[PDB]
Amino acid sequence: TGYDAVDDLLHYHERGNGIQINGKDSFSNEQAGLFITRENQTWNGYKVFGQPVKLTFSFPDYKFSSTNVAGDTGLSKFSAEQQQQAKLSLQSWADVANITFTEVAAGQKANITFGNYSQDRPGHYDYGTQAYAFLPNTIWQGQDLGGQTWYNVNQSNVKHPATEDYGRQTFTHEIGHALGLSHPGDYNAGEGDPTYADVTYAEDTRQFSLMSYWSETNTGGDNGGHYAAAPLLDDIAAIQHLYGANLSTRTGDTVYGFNSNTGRDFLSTTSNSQKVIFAAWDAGGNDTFDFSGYTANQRINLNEKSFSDVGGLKGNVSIAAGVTIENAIGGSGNDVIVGNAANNVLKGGAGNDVLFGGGGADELWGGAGKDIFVFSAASDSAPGASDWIRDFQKGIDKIDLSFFDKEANSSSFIHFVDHFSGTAGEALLSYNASSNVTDLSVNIGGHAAPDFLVKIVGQVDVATDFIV
Numbered sequence: 001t002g003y004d005a006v007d008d009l010l011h012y013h014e015r016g017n018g019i020q021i022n023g024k025d026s027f028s029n030e031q032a033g034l035f036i037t038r039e040n041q042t043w044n045g046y047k048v049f050g051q052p053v054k055l056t057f058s059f060p061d062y063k064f065s066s067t068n069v070a071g072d073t074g075l076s077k078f079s080a081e082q083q084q085q086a087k088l089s090l091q092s093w094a095d096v097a098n099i100t101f102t103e104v105a106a107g108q109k110a111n112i113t114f115g116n117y118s119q120d121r122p123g124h125y126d127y128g129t130q131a132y133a134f135l136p137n138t139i140w141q142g143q144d145l146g147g148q149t150w151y152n153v154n155q156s157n158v159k160h161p162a163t164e165d166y167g168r169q170t171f172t173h174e175i176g177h178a179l180g181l182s183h184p185g186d187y188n189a190g191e192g193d194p195t196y197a198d199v200t201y202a203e204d205t206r207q208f209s210l211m212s213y214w215s216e217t218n219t220g221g222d223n224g225g226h227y228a229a230a231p232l233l234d235d236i237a238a239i240q241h242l243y244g245a246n247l248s249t250r251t252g253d254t255v256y257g258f259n260s261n262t263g264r265d266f267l268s269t270t271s272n273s274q275k276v277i278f279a280a281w282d283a284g285g286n287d288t289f290d291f292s293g294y295t296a297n298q299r300i301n302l303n304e305k306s307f308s309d310v311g312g313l314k315g316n317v318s319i320a321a322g323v324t325i326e327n328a329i330g331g332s333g334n335d336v337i338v339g340n341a342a343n344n345v346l347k348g349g350a351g352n353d354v355l356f357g358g359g360g361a362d363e364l365w366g367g368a369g370k371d372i373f374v375f376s377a378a379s380d381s382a383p384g385a386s387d388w389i390r391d392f393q394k395g396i397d398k399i400d401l402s403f404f405d406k407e408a409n410s411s412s413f414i415h416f417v418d419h420f421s422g423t424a425g426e427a428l429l430s431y432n433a434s435s436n437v438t439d440l441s442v443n444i445g446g447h448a449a450p451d452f453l454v455k456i457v458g459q460v461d462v463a464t465d466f467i468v
């Protein structure tokens with residue numbers, strides 16, 4: 001049934017509350033954020049949390065023959081392409097927490113610096129390392145190393161971050177360290193051989209945090225060979241814990257995905273081939289997840305902290321804690337679209353879709369195809385805040401009320417009548433041929449009056465259009 005599909009999406013990636021996944025403990029979004037910042041170091045001071053911060057950054061002109069604090073040499077300044085991508089990574093962190101970044105001249109002392117290295121010793125090129133950075137307040141010989149980030153330019157992804165997404169992710173990851181974030185678990189490579197089996201909690205994967213090195217496939221995600229460019233779900237919790245949530249970000253009506261007005265590369269796409277991977281942070285307005293241009297079967301959940309399967313990928317889109325996204329538009333595939341307690345405009349597009357509005361007064365459009373509109377509570381469409389199904393086609397679309405009889409474990413609870421009598425479970429269809437509107441009223445609670453009312457544009461055939 002349509003309800004089965006909804007129920008499935010609602011319990012996708014449940015976490016915390018004593019759950020154990022992969023033989024590992026499951027941490028909630030909150031716990032993961034705290035664990036990722038377990039070093040307690042911030043630019044505001046040790047254990048000083050929730051305060052804004054203003055930081056400077058620059059691209060120093062390093063001398064090739066110079067040796068850095070780590071012992072690496074064959075140094076160089078960031079190229080134009082590298083600088084451009086580093087600035088995009090910085091902004092992605094500034095979008096979510098109260099952090100202000102300001103670029104200073106190559107000579108001026110800056111809090112965060114970017115530099116390339118190519119040799120582990122003079123005259124010897126290093127093809128084995130990727131990058132590293134120092135957390136704030138890292139003191140060495142009376143000097144703070146905090147804010148320094150270094151990258152192995154012999155790696156093509158580091159040299160070409162604009163075309164190699166792992167390079168862009170690396171910039172975001174190292175800057176994360178420079179801001180106070182650690183990897184989600186303790187494990188040393190090089191002089192150690194860690195694997196996902198060495199994680200502290202199940203959600204330590206690239207599906208939840210880009211501070212992680214473990215594949216998203218470990219938790220059931222699948223990014224189709226791509227890498228997230230910006231802070232993921234648990235990274236947002238981590239960074240906002242340190243510097244507070246940015247309440248000024250995208251406060252207007254924002255569109256994510258296709259036809260985006262975000263002005264962010266990782267939140268926008270112009271074709272079915274260009275895949276999105278992101279955790280959405282949005283501080284206000286009436287917002288829309290527009291995934292209309294994708295052909296794959298998608299699963300879109302508008303609940304906060306929940307995961308969606310978008311554009312042919314799995315668990316690649318999520319919504320941060322405290323964010324309310326209002327609308328969703330599916331693509332040409334057979335989609336499952338689950339709304340939240342707010343008023344939502346849900347559009348299935350072509351294909352056979354399953355739409356679930358949840359609470360609030362929702363506006364549901366099945367579009368072309370055999371669509372199913374699902375309900376599981378009187379509050380889903382309360383009289384006075386009724387849902388509207390705007391394009392119902394009798395004999396083609398369906399209204400799924402199967403939840404009620406299943407819960408009641410009775411085939412006679414929900415049953416259609418031609419007139420009410422106060423009995424619980426009575427359902428009544430009222431068709432107005434002049435206005436082309438059908439009222440579906442149900443007395444679920446067994447009150448004097450119906451406690452559930454859906455308004456439908458179009459005729460409904462009781463003999464063929466319901467799943468009970």
Ligand SMILES: [Ca+2]
Nearest residue numbers: 250254284285
């Ligand atoms: Ca917005």
Ligand SMILES: [Ca+2]
Nearest residue numbers: 284285287324
């Ligand atoms: Ca909103």
Ligand SMILES: [Ca+2]
Nearest residue numbers: 331333348351
């Ligand atoms: Ca669709």
Ligand SMILES: [Ca+2]
Nearest residue numbers: 349366368369
């Ligand atoms: Ca459809």
Ligand SMILES: [Ca+2]
Nearest residue numbers: 340342357359
């Ligand atoms: Ca809703």
Ligand SMILES: [Ca+2]
Nearest residue numbers: 366367368369
């Ligand atoms: Ca339809």
Ligand SMILES: [Ca+2]
Nearest residue numbers: 358359360380
């Ligand atoms: Ca509703």
Ligand SMILES: [Zn+2]
Nearest residue numbers: 173177183211
């Ligand atoms: Zn790292």
